[PDB]
Amino acid sequence: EEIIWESLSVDVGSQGNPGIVEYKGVDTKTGEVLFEREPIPIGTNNMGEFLAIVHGLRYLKERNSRKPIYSDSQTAIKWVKDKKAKSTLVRNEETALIWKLVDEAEEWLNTHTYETPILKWQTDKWGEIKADYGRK
RNA sequence: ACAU
DNA sequence: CGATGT
Ligand SMILES: [K+]
Ligand SMILES: [K+]
Ligand SMILES: [K+]
Ligand SMILES: [Mg+2]
Ligand SMILES: [Mg+2]
């Protein structure tokens, strides 16, 4: 603790895993929805969590904001740190779109800088992240 | 085990 | 119960 309330919180939502994936980012303090990605027909939870963080980085950088990002995904936080999404999802025609977005997110990370802290949301202490989809 |  | 990940 404690929660850094001046922050952006992101989360994935899905219908199946693998399944339809979407994500959104919210103001941690107010819950205001700041961005929401159109659903992607097939992806994994972790790909979506990764895309949500990278989109947050891009959203904050464009707005000259130094706020941190919270994610509840140990996996996606590590993938962003490594600039490499180590997903097991088959690459095929059905998964081409999510894999294109993941490839492009990695490419963005490899061509841009940021100081944004990427912080673990401590669900066990604080409850569900503010960007959660309320589906579980 | 832990994080989803 | 199933799945994605370290
Ligand atoms: K949920
Ligand atoms: K969770
Ligand atoms: K497991
Ligand atoms: Mg999550
Ligand atoms: Mg959630």
Model resolution, angstroms = 1.4
The residues spanned by each domain of chain A are 1-136
Neighbours of A45 (CB within 10 A): 18
Protein residue closest via CA to C1' of C2: A17
Give A30 Cα–ligand 3 centroid separation in angstroms.
Answer: 33
**Token digits for A135?**
């589906």
DSSP string, A50-78: HHHHHHHHHHHHHTT----EEES-HHHHH
Neighbours of A33 (CB within 10 A): 11
Distance CA A8, CA A4 (A): 9
Distance CA A79, CA A66 (A): 21
What's chain A's length in residues? 136
**Per CATH, the architecture of A1-136 is what?**
2-Layer Sandwich (3.30)
Looking at the CA of A131, which ligand is closest? Answer: 5
Helix (H) or strand (E) holding A40: strand A33-43
* A44 is near strand C: CB distance < 7 Å: yes
Distance CA A130, CA A121 (A): 10
Distance CA A33, CA A103 (A): 26
Experimental method: X-ray
Tell me which residue of A30, A23, A33 sits closest to A102, measured CA to CA.
A23
Distance CA A13, CA A37 (A): 10
